[PDB]
Amino acid sequence: ANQASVVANQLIPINTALTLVMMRSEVVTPVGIPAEDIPRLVSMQVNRAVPLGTTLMPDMVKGYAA
């Protein structure tokens, strides 16, 4: 139920280091990367461009392992 995920706050381009302005927290379905992981994601890279409003999933971030 009320578990919040990391959602793209702007289009995130491929192979670009994640910054805090790119990530917001939102309750969405399906559930993606927990919103508590936003600090851990800073400077990690996505392996695909992520459109605005997309829920970040584990498989999209290079090197991510919960």
Report CA 45 to chain centroid distance, whole Å: 10
Amino acid at 20: L
Report the alpha-carbon distance of residue 63 to residue 66 in Å, rounded.
Answer: 10
| 45 phi and psi angles, rounded to 5 deg | -115, 150
User: Is the alpha carbon torsion for 33, 12, 63, 44 positive or negative?
Assistant: negative
Task: Give the C-alpha separation, 39 to 37, whole Å.
Answer: 6
Resolution (A): 1.6
Strand partners for 48: none
Q: Where are the domains of the chain?
A: 1-66
Give me the CATH topology for the region 1-66.
Answer: Type Iii Antifreeze Protein Isoform Hplc 12 (3.90.1210)
d(CA 2, CA 40): 21
- The 10 Å Cβ neighbour count of residue 14 is 10
